[PDB]
Write a protein that binds this ligand. Sequence first.
Ligand code: SF4
Ligand SMILES: [Ca+2]
Ligand SMILES: [Ca+2]
Ligand SMILES: [Ca+2]
Length: 351
Amino acid sequence: RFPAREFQRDLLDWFARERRDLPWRKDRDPYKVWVSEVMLQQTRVETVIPYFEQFIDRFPTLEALADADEDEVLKAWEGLGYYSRVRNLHAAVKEVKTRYGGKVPDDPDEFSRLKGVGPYTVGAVLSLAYGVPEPAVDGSVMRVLSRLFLVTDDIAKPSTRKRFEQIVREIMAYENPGAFNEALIELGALVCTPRRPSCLLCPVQAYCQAFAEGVAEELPVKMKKTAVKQVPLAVAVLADDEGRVLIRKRDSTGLLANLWEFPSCETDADGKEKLEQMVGEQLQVELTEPIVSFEHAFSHLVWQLTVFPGRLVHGGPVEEPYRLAPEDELKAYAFPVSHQRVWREYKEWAS
DNA sequence: AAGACGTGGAC
DNA sequence: GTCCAGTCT
Ligand code: SF4
Ligand SMILES: [Ca+2]
Ligand SMILES: [Ca+2]
Ligand SMILES: [Ca+2]
């Protein structure tokens, strides 16, 4: 029905001709491919390129990452988002060193056992680094395949992803599977773009049923996103007379897990009040009026932050999860972007 | 299944 | 504003 080998040929030649020279493509080392594929989940390539280089410079091999402290790794991920990806990778890498002696499994079932490795990552890593002919269907590929075969199923359903995965199995180039999988991802990035695809330049315009019908711009099919709750948040920037600041490490479960932050309370509506009470219970502190208010978006909620400066006097030890940090050492802790802005606004207010 | 889970570009 | 650049529970 589908001229698979003709489609494979028109794609793979295009790939050779138009492939971008990205850092993770300098070799096919499984470790580096694994890091890059994780970083690229839900994250733009232009954004990832610098994080990848810092990360591989600090953690050049699978063992260097494994032997690293959890805090050093989170700092290297600081600002990339979805931080459980890196906690899972660290643990998954640890497992590969402890269990598998530092060798990345080439068995899909064995690799998918690792934390943070789901259907896309198994296919991406194993097809590119090891040649395994497993599909690597991400949102981009699903958009490409939904136009090539005019599939109107909701790509959000896992089932739809499984149909596309089956479609890949039928049309794949088993001769060079990794190149086939990367070419579909590259095709999605460069040609078959989310809006206004450049189908006239597309290597596979002849094989595309959506272009035939003139509805490429109407695919893929996807349900509109659920709106996000708004959460007010009260943040305390507290410094003593020696310039040191009070920060706390978030629980290892949930939002921004194991990241550092300035002490805060969700104030659903007394700000300086709910902040002062909380601080004592975990220190004698009295809070002043707020200096700025701003918003910070997550995928599923929006923080509405209010910053309250304050003075801190030591009347006891700083007990876990809190730490007393000189200003010059705050650079060493990983903060979420919201709280990086807290400090920015606080430091510009001080002047 | 659906929500949790960050951040930044492009439209 | 919208859409989008996968995995866990
Ligand atoms: S012809 Fe157009 S819609 Fe079809 S795969 Fe190419 S860019 Fe996408
Ligand atoms: Ca898995
Ligand atoms: Ca993509
Ligand atoms: Ca928690």
